[PDB]
Symmetry: D2
Subunit: 379 residues, 4 copies
């Protein structure tokens, strides 16, 4: 779109930073030892990347959505897992706090994660409930002085590293999608237990496991907003989160392309260089135009959010198209690198593996199509 | 992108107009009798659609590029051939006049075509020179009091209806791309003769033939700008023209989609309506998201032109992606209509046929990829 | 696959024939005047092309299914409409006779159409019943000595040229798919009336209209096989018909490819010939490998039919994949021809238009996917 | 095609075998410890899988090419790395021996690898010479009683496990593609040294490194056939090898599809089971029809080889189309599994990673297109 002069500066910051602090030496160590260095996280919160769109009124940074997408893109370009550690407090953890949270809860909960002292997990997915989050099975019972919960959450990002976790349980089992409340649970409490870290294909550096809740008591003073609102809470958080996922799609995309034209300029085979063979140069073109076309897709979505019009469709398109053509791009970049793009030392293979969940998690491409077509066909 | 409040009004105008004046009854008669009604052309120039981006300083309308794209889109949606009769004086005829034309030439030539009295053909393509316009063969010789030309131009839109035609001939046969001048030729003069109207697949209502030049003398006072500049003249006209072609791609696209979701809402087969079958609804989604993604592509290109930064890449992407996904869309719309979308009474078949040149003319998709990749790979 | 030496001979015949009798001069007149020359049909039946798979036991020709596909392919390469006039008596007309017809019915009905004296239309589709042929609305009532019918059929190939027509009507309206009988109706009789010839996009030379039935009485002696088997009758004819449609898919494909590499060898741009630009040569490759891959798909289906195992899935895959990649091929061939491929004199545009229905009629690609997936997931 | 009854039996054997000996427990340990169990290789040679197409005349097994593809497919379905350990002695090692090797050389070299005592690496690729194998830089000098070599080979499968290696060096540096001889070098000799094992994305269990030659002297008695024929030797081995690669393409495809429809039958969302949502069932269909279409592509190529006509194009199409649509399939299968398909315990992710090299090695898809188009346009 068009970038505000402050957002151009932020772009400059996230560039020099993400490029400078995420060295080859480190990122290799993250894949081998699935542990992101706490020192870097602290370093990020110190300059506020953990607080981009939250305003100074609550002790944030006072940026706009476009600044969140800009930082998301420019980070994810260099490393995927970095992006994961970035989106959580900006969007998935700091979302429902920012919407359905009393002033006390925000004082005791949000500012810690913006400054990097506390870590917060957004926990919705169950073994029986994936795309159909409305078909949850975790229960939440009102006992008066506290709430009692009994359930199980799979695929919970960062959870073993998290201190509290926003967990969605079914309060009114009859109302279904109308009867879900949202609670803040201290993961250190009773009954709560974690599953094994899951061995995933990519995005290695951030642990991901199950949250098991066994007769865990949660005080009433730690419930998110109104009772039976939890579902709308999670949707309206999910829109900005999906903007996040499309944002990292576009990041790692632009990156794998940059590595693409670099290798294609440098490698020679028939006396010509690779990039002077028509098949390749056209292929580069094709990738470039999709990437831009759709950069414009997602930029537009975020600008809508910033000007307060509903972005529920526009974001869904952004996540869908961005992640899909990201995968197409990542693959093609392998193919330009040729054989060498299959060895782990060439950065393009880590990308190719990373960019695959992008079409699954945060709502599959199918769920995206369901939202969009369902929005265009109502009569 | 974001639309200026005047451009929203223009959108309203071109909508009510194109919708109101291009009735089924007429458009059917245009396909049967390959003749667009002069009365409608006059009607268009009377409200200035023939003069959108040319400023009031020269007797134009004072709009911006985004207003040219808006009108191009909203017209082309309803009828392709209408768009053709629209882009000519706005972009292809009024371009080189606006750039490399003396004040006298513009007084005697441009204002007529803005008011619809004169018609001007942009003639570059030869039988031997297509994508490679630099390999022209029409010659132009300096005799002192006039220029003498000898050549032949194929595929010249509107030419039998045109009064003068901007014709590019080779002056310095040795310089090639560096030695091409541009001349204004009265088509009524000596030696000049026209070929047969070509029977094309779609875009029926506008005649298209060869311009044959046989020892035709042209006065020196009718040359475009400097000698041997003609080529750069034609390129810099071609950028805004390509914006035009992408503009009509996006128009007829949005239209065939609108007909798409309409038929899919109305038709019933298994008791359900068509649109409630998952394959279709998802298909609608896919088409919609590409179309928007890329609407954002071309809107962005035009905004760049309006703010004076070079749009030579951005436009090329716009023409490429827009026309290609337009064809994909047009086809899919046939497939939703099912059998009925194969009969001429259903508007979708005229679209499907129209939208096919979009990837060929104004520079093929291959030439587009050549420009783009060649721009990204220079080292 | 591997062709039996007699089938190679048949390939030679249909090649030299279709090439020699279907000249450019004729086919243009067929497009302009939507009338195929009766003299050519007679000429075809005289050498037996009207009777390929019907055996000499009934006075047919004694070929195998692979011989029907061979003639279908080699004809369709040269002209689409020829194929339409070819498949009808081989598959669509001679099918239900061959399954559920007594020897008398075959004596009075089939031999005429094998020798080209009579013409038979296969009429199933209604305005309300397309893909869902089971939701028919045409009725058939038992009066003892004859049946009484009241309904309406759209999109009936060749019908205004046909002497009798196999019409599927609902006898037991409650049984639905289980309660449909098939009757032979002489179109010259009472009540029978035709709709307008439909103006279709391509495949021009064969009329196609509605068959309107208003209290038309039909004798019992003209019913297909047992009562209420008709639906399975029509399905099992539809399988070999679908083999037909894939056959012409593969035909027009080979043609448009042959024009593709021919034009690409002959035309030169920028000094090189077209075919020496890497993009084109690769494009040719891509079309070729798909085409072959899937030629092998369809040859195999027909060979299965010849060795008597059920070919109901395999044919469905053949029709689906063959028709879709046929369209992709046809388009790409236009794009190689460049601008010239948009004028009707270049054969590639007639192909491009013909090959479009291929994915709709004889069961859409969607119906194909429904059949195939429904066949693979039953456990 | 149509399988000879002995080849159906062989299909049964390789199925029950690959299924019974390659258990989940083992294959996980192979990924973790990049070492395939020697006990299994011995077990395979004991039943002759190491000698499929080599005939009993030389102490082989007497199968046909179709039997090599059958075992390749049915093995690769279950595990990719198994296939790698399978194709080497059948095609890549036993190829050049079979063409340009004297009976003594075959006595001392081939029978060991058919019985699994010795291992032979096919070493052609250099760091400067990939697709352009003709631009080699390894040298071979004639000293009379032996040859002296100095060069370097990257990406040599199985090399650290191999006892001898067929190495292609340039003898006449001026003749280029016409001046390459092929030699057998015992890897335990002098000068010979190995590079590091390369960390590849998938196909983990088989080591792959550089073969470094530093003034290694090789006796004349170990040269392949006539001098300077070696290149055509290596090409004509590469054709059957490419048939191999397409064979495993088709294998891992069938596997990932089988996991696809299995998971899609068992998993239920929103109340329905996965497979009863139209998008999925159609997706399954699409993968299936392509897979079959092209299974037929490759079966046919191998049958041609068995009946002795040149299969150089047909195999190239088979490798190209087979590997590409294999990747498309593998990915889509991930997407059906949803989130769970991104964790290593679900077999589909190992497939997805394995099937990626398939389009690069044994000649890239680009080299395939170059061969195919170059074969179709020569006139
Ligand atoms: C797991 C594995 C095992 C291997 N085993 C063996 C083995 O046993 N023996 C062996 O000899 N090799 C082996 N190789 C090497 C492999 O076969 C080759 O590397 C392969 O041919 C590609 O080589 P390259 O990457 O150097 O090609 P590069 O030339 O480096 O790649 C160029 C890229 O651009 C494309 N390209 C190349 N030339 C052109 C052109 N003129 N026009 C357009 N596009 C072009 C290609 O498609 C490719 O994508 C193995 C590789 C791997 C990954
Ligand atoms: C040139 C021509 C010749 C013909 N000749 C004959 C002939 O000789 N005999 C004859 O009987 N018919 C004939 N037909 C009719 C043709 O075979 C049928 O119309 C065809 O089956 C499609 O019918 P329809 O358009 O009504 O389908 P519609 O149902 O009107 O179309 C529905 C559309 O949505 C899709 N769709 C349908 N149901 C579903 C679903 N449940 N889920 C998802 N998607 C769905 C379909 O793919 C299709 O694109 C002819 C048609 C043409 C164009
Ligand atoms: C309706 C219509 C209106 C037109 N109006 C005008 C007009 O007003 N003015 C005008 O000047 N022209 C006009 N044209 C012509 C059109 O602009 C030209 O045809 C177009 O620029 C391409 O020329 P060509 O068709 O001759 O392409 P050709 O070059 O003849 O065709 C070459 C083909 O191969 C590809 N190709 C070409 N060069 C290369 C390369 N180097 N590498 C790889 N692939 C390549 C192209 O994609 C194309 O498919 C019109 C055409 C049509 C159909
Ligand atoms: C790295 C990672 C991190 C994650 N982090 C989180 C997290 O922080 N919080 C969280 O809540 N979840 C998280 N998840 C889980 C993820 O959000 C869910 O998996 C996702 O929402 C989809 O759920 P599912 O994978 O179970 O899909 P499933 O529903 O189990 O899979 C169904 C499959 O079929 C398709 N499908 C589903 N429903 C339909 C339908 N109605 N019609 C047609 N097709 C359909 C889908 O595309 C999908 O491919 C994470 C997952 C991963 C891999």
């Amino acid at each position: 779109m068009y970038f505000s002069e402050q957002n151009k500066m932020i772009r400059k910051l996230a560039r020099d930073f993400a490029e400078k602090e995420l060295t080859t030496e480190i990122l290799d160590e993250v894949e081998e030892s699935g542990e992101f260095p706490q020192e870097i996280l602290d370093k990020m919160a110190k300059f506020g990347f953990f607080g981009i769109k939250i305003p100074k009124s609550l002790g944030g940074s006072g940026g706009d959505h476009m600044s969140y997408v800009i930082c998301m893109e420019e980070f994810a370009r260099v490393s995927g897992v970095a992006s994961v550690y970035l989106s959580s407090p900006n969007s998935l953890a700091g979302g429902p706090l920012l919407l359905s949270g009393t002033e006390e809860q925000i004082e005791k909960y949000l500012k810690p994660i913006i400054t990097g002292k506390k870590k917060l997990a957004f926990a919705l997915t169950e073994p029986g409930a994936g795309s159909d989050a409305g078909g949850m099975s975790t229960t939440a019972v009102d006992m008066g002085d506290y709430y009692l919960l009994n359930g199980r959450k799979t695929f919970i990002t960062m959870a073993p590293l998290c201190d509290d976790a926003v967990i969605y349980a079914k309060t009114d089992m009859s109302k279904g999608t109308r009867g879900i409340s949202a609670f803040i649970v201290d993961l250190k409490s009773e009954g709560v237990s974690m599953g094994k870290n899951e061995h995933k294909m990519g995005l290695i550096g951030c642990a991901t496991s199950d949250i098991i809740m066994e007769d865990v008591k949660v005080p009433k003073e730690n419930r998110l907003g109104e009772v039976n609102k939890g579902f709308s809470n999670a949707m309206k958080t999910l829109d900005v989160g999906r903007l996040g996922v499309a944002s990292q799609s576009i990041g790692v995309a632009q990156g794998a392309l940059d590595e693409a034209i670099k290798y294609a300029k440098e490698r020679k085979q028939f006396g010509k260089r690779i990039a002077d063979f028509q098949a390749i140069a056209f292929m580069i073109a094709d990738m470039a135009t999709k990437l831009e076309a759709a950069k414009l897709l997602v930029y537009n979505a975020a600008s809508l959010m910033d000007n307060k019009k509903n972005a529920t469709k526009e974001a869904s398109m952004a996540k869908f198209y961005a992640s899909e053509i990201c995968n197409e791009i990542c693959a093609k970049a392998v193919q330009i690198h040729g054989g060498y793009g299959y060895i782990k030392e060439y950065k393009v293979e880590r990308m190719y593996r990373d960019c695959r969940v992008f079409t699954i998690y945060e709502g599959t491409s199918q769920v995206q199509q369901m939202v969009i077509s369902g929005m265009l066909l109502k009569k």
